[PDB]
Symmetry: C2
Subunit: 365 residues, 2 copies
């Protein structure tokens, strides 16, 4: 019959570390799945579909236009290419050679992140740019950034993630927009796993990048929204460095159905339901022998709740984390606080049956 | 009479953000002050004093030898120069020109910190080296570091601070030592504000840098301890790039008296006294109108305690922080958690009269 994971010997896993790309991103709702199936039955003008999908994604973000991509990593490469090559078909097809165009891409040292091993500076190089890192991980003064903007500067890159990037004594986004407007250089925003669909565009940034499977519950996909002229320069890159970064019509329709369902549920019900589900889950874990648990808000200051595990060695935090990933139902928890002897259970990719699969696997030790 | 701060119009300040360099570092005990005064009355062979002070500082750290410096920033420059120029008097006096010596200094992207605005890579350039940053702030695989070590590599730099540097999915120190021993390249450790005087040397690193005023309660000073041959190459740099980084005999004797007093008080009494003093201080603050307080261990996982303030806007966290630094007794608190609407009160530079100066200044608002 139809091939499934069990046919390939791939047993599913339990994701208690949110929508990780190495874990397939996220699971789709029945509506997202059905949208991918209906789009796979007809031939459509992809230029007309891209223009229509862009206006849909721009309205949901309050921006001028939008351009779908495969994800946040491809979003950065295309956004940089749009600022370097523009819409000239010959310059587009000559990238990553910048030719005679300014291609310096300025960013703070603390924002030099990696996309699953691929550095953000490598995505800048694919788009014909050269990364110029300013400041240090613990400090980057505003004057350091403004002095780094010259006639050879093509764009400014800002990473919003307080999990993968560091912002301590850095330059805020509104300061970068003020710097960009002062010299006339675009500002590119990496908002890969951000839930706010309008706050980052409202900052005045020219291009804002979202990843699909992170929060919107979409298949492998993404989009770049912002100013109309630069979003138009993004689309032109699909005749160049963005040609290998294909976006199938099934992924795009599945992405639009994910946004329509995301903008329907209010953020209050999604936060309250998670806050009450993790409060009930933290009680079941705190009663385990030699394990303390409590509901804790996101340390970065977001409306996301999890269960901070206190793996006291009287009952090893590092050894116990590997024990969960090797059981019969493979379970992946957040281990960023393993140096503090702690672990976390993220509910953003955890099914109700997945919650029971974690309490049972924990009770067996 | 004798000139003091009041004669210059400099009014003292209250340090609730530990021993910050911009705040004069730290205050000295009566014994440290007396040691600086007694050393200022006699002429001594500085080579004999440096040899004697090195053996004293090496015994307290369990290393082979030690070399005093002005502080952690100068420690990095001299340690790099020791790995690049060695002990050749001509190469020492030709730095920061490396000549024909290998001068690549490999470090993780997350460890590219700054010393009060001066980047760590700039300190590497002063010592005749070239910084090679590997990986990203959120990830740096071990293979990335080992592949970056070539015949042109002079040393490996590791920053221990979990406050100013990022270690998330990075390379641990014992892995760097294994990499250094594999290729035969020294390992340089920035342990500026570390309290452990022996754990970092015991890791096998060749050179370990400590800053005086940070934890040891010393005047402006510092030292580099580690392997004998490289510590000898550090001393030779004082005929070169370390000549402007003078260390007066008063600062050095004051540093040794600080180490003798530090190794006398057990870490149990210093941690218990702080844990009980901040527990009593957190109760006086939690009773303030619209302010919650509690004793919290160091988020990085250290035996240091502070009072996490919950500045609810019902009674602005950012505005209230500036209000404390502008009062009649200027008070500086930790504002690294201001994005979370919080603030901290560090007791490492807070006198008992300084504690009362903070509760009174907080009660006046």
């Amino acid at each position: 019959h139809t091939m499934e994971y069990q046919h390939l010997g791939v047993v599913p896993v339990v994701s208690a570390q949110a929508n990780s790309t190495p874990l397939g991103g996220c699971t789709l709702s029945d509506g997202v799945i059905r949208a991918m199936g209906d789009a796979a039955r007809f031939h459509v003008d992809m230029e007309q579909l891209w223009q229509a999908a862009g206006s849909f994604l721009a309205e949901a973000t309050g921006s001028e236009d939008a351009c779908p991509v495969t994800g946040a990593a491809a979003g950065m490469a295309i956004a940089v290419a749009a600022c370097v090559a523009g819409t000239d078909g010959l310059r587009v097809q000559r990238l990553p050679d910048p030719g005679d165009q300014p291609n310096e891409i300025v960013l703070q040292k603390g924002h030099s992140i990696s996309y699953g091993g691929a550095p953000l500076a490598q995505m800048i190089a694919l788009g014909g740019g050269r990364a110029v890192e300013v400041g240090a991980v613990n400090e980057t003064p505003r004057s350091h950034v403004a002095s780094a903007v010259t006639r050879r500067t093509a764009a400014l890159v800002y990473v919003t993630s307080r999990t993968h990037a560091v912002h301590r004594k850095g330059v805020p986004l509104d300061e970068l927009v003020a710097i960009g407007r002062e010299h006339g250089v675009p500002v590119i925003v990496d908002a890969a796993g951000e839930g706010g669909l309008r706050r980052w565009v409202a900052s005045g940034a020219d291009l804002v990048i979202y990843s699909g499977p992170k929060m919107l519950g979409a298949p492998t996909s993404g989009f770049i929204c912002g100013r109309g002229d630069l979003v138009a320069a993004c689309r032109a890159q699909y005749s160049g460095i963005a040609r290998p970064m294909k976006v199938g019509k099934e992924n795009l329709l599945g992405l639009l159905q994910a946004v329509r369902e995301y903008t329907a549920v209010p953020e209050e019900q999604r936060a309250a339901e998670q806050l009450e589900r993790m409060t009930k889950l933290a009680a079941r874990l705190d009663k385990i022998p030699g394990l303390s648990a409590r509901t804790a808000q996101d340390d970065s200051g977001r409306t996301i709740y999890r269960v901070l595990l206190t793996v006291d060695p009287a009952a090893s935090a590092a050894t116990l984390a590997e024990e969960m990933r090797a059981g019969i139902p493979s379970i992946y928890l957040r281990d960023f606080k393993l140096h503090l002897g702690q672990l976390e259970v993220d509910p953003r990719a955890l099914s109700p049956d997945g919650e029971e699969s974690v309490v049972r696997r924990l009770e067996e030790l």
